[PDB]
Design an enzyme around this catalytic site. Sequence first.
Site, PDB file in Angstrom:
ATOM      1  N   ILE A  10       0.826  -1.213  -0.133  1.00 12.88           N
ATOM      2  CA  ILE A  10       0.165  -0.048   0.039  1.00 12.88           C
ATOM      3  C   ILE A  10       0.949   1.378   0.029  1.00 12.88           C
ATOM      4  O   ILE A  10       0.366   2.469  -0.111  1.00 12.88           O
ATOM      5  CB  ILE A  10      -1.024   0.057   1.052  1.00 12.88           C
ATOM      6  N   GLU A  12       5.297   2.799   0.237  1.00 13.94           N
ATOM      7  CA  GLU A  12       6.668   2.895   0.519  1.00 13.94           C
ATOM      8  C   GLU A  12       7.126   4.143   1.071  1.00 13.94           C
ATOM      9  O   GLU A  12       6.711   5.387   0.484  1.00 13.94           O
ATOM     10  CB  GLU A  12       7.425   2.647  -0.816  1.00 13.94           C
ATOM     11  N   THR A  14      10.161   6.510   4.046  1.00 11.29           N
ATOM     12  CA  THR A  14      11.199   6.871   4.433  1.00 11.29           C
ATOM     13  C   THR A  14      11.909   5.543   5.354  1.00 11.29           C
ATOM     14  O   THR A  14      12.899   5.078   4.981  1.00 11.29           O
ATOM     15  CB  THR A  14      11.630   8.145   5.244  1.00 11.29           C
ATOM     16  N   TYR A  15      11.038   5.162   6.457  1.00 16.63           N
ATOM     17  CA  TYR A  15      11.361   4.060   7.225  1.00 16.63           C
ATOM     18  C   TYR A  15      11.241   2.730   6.690  1.00 16.63           C
ATOM     19  O   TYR A  15      11.531   1.966   7.233  1.00 16.63           O
ATOM     20  CB  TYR A  15      10.756   4.309   8.578  1.00 16.63           C
ATOM     21  N   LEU A  78      -6.489   1.558   7.626  1.00 20.50           N
ATOM     22  CA  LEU A  78      -7.718   2.626   7.162  1.00 20.50           C
ATOM     23  C   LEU A  78      -7.660   2.403   5.557  1.00 20.50           C
ATOM     24  O   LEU A  78      -6.514   2.178   4.995  1.00 20.50           O
ATOM     25  CB  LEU A  78      -7.458   3.974   7.551  1.00 20.50           C
ATOM     26  N   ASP A 122       7.011  14.959   9.182  1.00 14.57           N
ATOM     27  CA  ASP A 122       6.813  15.046   7.968  1.00 14.57           C
ATOM     28  C   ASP A 122       5.116  14.703   7.561  1.00 14.57           C
ATOM     29  O   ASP A 122       5.048  13.618   6.756  1.00 14.57           O
ATOM     30  CB  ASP A 122       7.639  13.753   7.587  1.00 14.57           C
ATOM     31  N   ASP A 140       2.716   7.309   9.969  1.00 18.06           N
ATOM     32  CA  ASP A 140       4.054   7.517   9.514  1.00 18.06           C
ATOM     33  C   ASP A 140       4.830   8.557  10.311  1.00 18.06           C
ATOM     34  O   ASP A 140       5.602   9.555   9.715  1.00 18.06           O
ATOM     35  CB  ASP A 140       3.972   7.848   8.138  1.00 18.06           C
TER      36      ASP A 140
HETATM   37  C1  LIG Z   1       3.801   4.298   2.882  1.00 22.59           C
HETATM   38  C2  LIG Z   1       4.018   5.675   3.682  1.00 22.59           C
HETATM   39  C3  LIG Z   1       2.948   6.747   3.543  1.00 22.59           C
HETATM   40  C4  LIG Z   1       4.262   5.255   5.224  1.00 22.59           C
HETATM   41  O1  LIG Z   1       2.977   5.042   5.654  1.00 22.59           O
HETATM   42  C5  LIG Z   1       2.906   4.424   6.940  1.00 22.59           C
HETATM   43  O2  LIG Z   1       3.865   4.366   7.868  1.00 22.59           O
HETATM   44  C6  LIG Z   1       1.484   3.577   7.388  1.00 22.59           C
HETATM   45  C7  LIG Z   1       1.274   3.378   9.002  1.00 22.59           C
HETATM   46  C8  LIG Z   1       0.077   2.963   9.256  1.00 22.59           C
HETATM   47  C9  LIG Z   1      -1.000   2.643   8.166  1.00 22.59           C
HETATM   48  C10 LIG Z   1      -0.661   2.970   6.868  1.00 22.59           C
HETATM   49  C11 LIG Z   1       0.688   3.511   6.682  1.00 22.59           C
HETATM   50  C12 LIG Z   1      -1.635   2.703   6.054  1.00 22.59           C
HETATM   51  N1  LIG Z   1      -1.911   2.978   4.754  1.00 22.59           N
HETATM   52  N2  LIG Z   1      -3.193   2.627   4.295  1.00 22.59           N
HETATM   53  C13 LIG Z   1      -3.501   3.015   3.205  1.00 22.59           C
HETATM   54  C14 LIG Z   1      -4.651   2.523   2.416  1.00 22.59           C
HETATM   55  C15 LIG Z   1      -5.120   2.854   1.248  1.00 22.59           C
HETATM   56  C16 LIG Z   1      -4.383   3.975   0.554  1.00 22.59           C
HETATM   57  S1  LIG Z   1      -5.028   4.387  -1.107  1.00 22.59           S
HETATM   58  N3  LIG Z   1      -3.744   5.194  -1.801  1.00 22.59           N
HETATM   59  O3  LIG Z   1      -6.025   5.716  -0.816  1.00 22.59           O
HETATM   60  O4  LIG Z   1      -5.732   3.389  -1.594  1.00 22.59           O
HETATM   61  C17 LIG Z   1      -3.059   4.402   1.164  1.00 22.59           C
HETATM   62  C18 LIG Z   1      -2.813   3.954   2.479  1.00 22.59           C
HETATM   63  C19 LIG Z   1      -2.645   2.217   6.984  1.00 22.59           C
HETATM   64  O5  LIG Z   1      -3.699   1.696   6.774  1.00 22.59           O
HETATM   65  N4  LIG Z   1      -2.222   2.053   8.303  1.00 22.59           N
END
Ligand SMILES: CC(C)COC(=O)c1ccc2c(c1)/C(=N/Nc1ccc(S(N)(=O)=O)cc1)C(=O)N2
Length: 280
Positions: A10, A12, A14-15, A78, A122, A140
């Site tokens: 879903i 990529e 920094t971490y 989410l 960020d 994030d």
């Molecule tokens: C990758 C980068 C930002 C670092 O991300 C994170 O550290 C992080 C942490 C806990 C998270 C999510 C990300 C997350 N992402 N969910 C998602 C679901 C659908 C779409 S979308 N593009 O609308 O289809 C985008 C994101 C989620 O659910 N919990």
Amino acid sequence: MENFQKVEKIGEGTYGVVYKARNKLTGEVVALKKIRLGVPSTAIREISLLKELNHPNIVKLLDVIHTENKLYLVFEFLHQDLKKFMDASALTGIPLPLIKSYLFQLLQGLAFCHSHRVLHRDLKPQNLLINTEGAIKLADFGLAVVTLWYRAPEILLGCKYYSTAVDIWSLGCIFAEMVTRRALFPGDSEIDQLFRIFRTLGTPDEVVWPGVTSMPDYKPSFPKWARQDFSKVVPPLDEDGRSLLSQMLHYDPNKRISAKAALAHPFFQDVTKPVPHLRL
Ligand SMILES: CC(C)COC(=O)c1ccc2c(c1)/C(=N/Nc1ccc(S(N)(=O)=O)cc1)C(=O)N2
């Protein structure tokens, strides 16, 4: 990590890399983050602190998996990020009551983080997550092409010990973007970012920002641009919204409004919690 079934990538960051995954034991759908690196002892303690930083507007960190000298973070899942929602709402615009609800909830999340001396550092639409209930959540953060569009000017000018005000700046940029349906400062290099800020808000000086000229990356040779009106910057946003935005975008981090003071701004007098139309 053999306890989780990966469904799809879903994101990529920094971490590390984030996957939608299913817990094989509980059936729980989660976001599994594989941390990009043995894991340092300081990293383990800082991440152990994040586990306790719980709030309705912060993505829940469910579990920290430090096994086989690898680090995985198990988060609440989410279904959409604000970037995808803003793209889907580009033809009509996000309704102002929903912009106001999302801004209010994020300021509540920030006021909570900031009261525990935790900075996001960020904020960007890609790490703001939304659900069908009308909630928006911060993701994030807490482990401290890269987007510079939401970076506070004190970071760009080389401040090593910046404050919670950097998050207020980022959120003000996101607020402007939700309102106008265009990024406020879409720089593609650190100097382009800085000069885009200067062209809109005016080149900062000692009058509006005491100490700016002694900052590590400040150059006296910076061009001197005059400030623009906010009526020109975020039309058709009402006077209350423009007033709040101007306070979120003050150059001096000490003058920049706090999350707690922004929650009391007259712009939120009529705040509500609408439900978004999400296409999942
Ligand atoms: C990758 C980068 C930002 C670092 O991300 C994170 O550290 C992080 C942490 C806990 C998270 C999510 C990300 C997350 N992402 N969910 C998602 C679901 C659908 C779409 S979308 N593009 O609308 O289809 C985008 C994101 C989620 O659910 N919990």
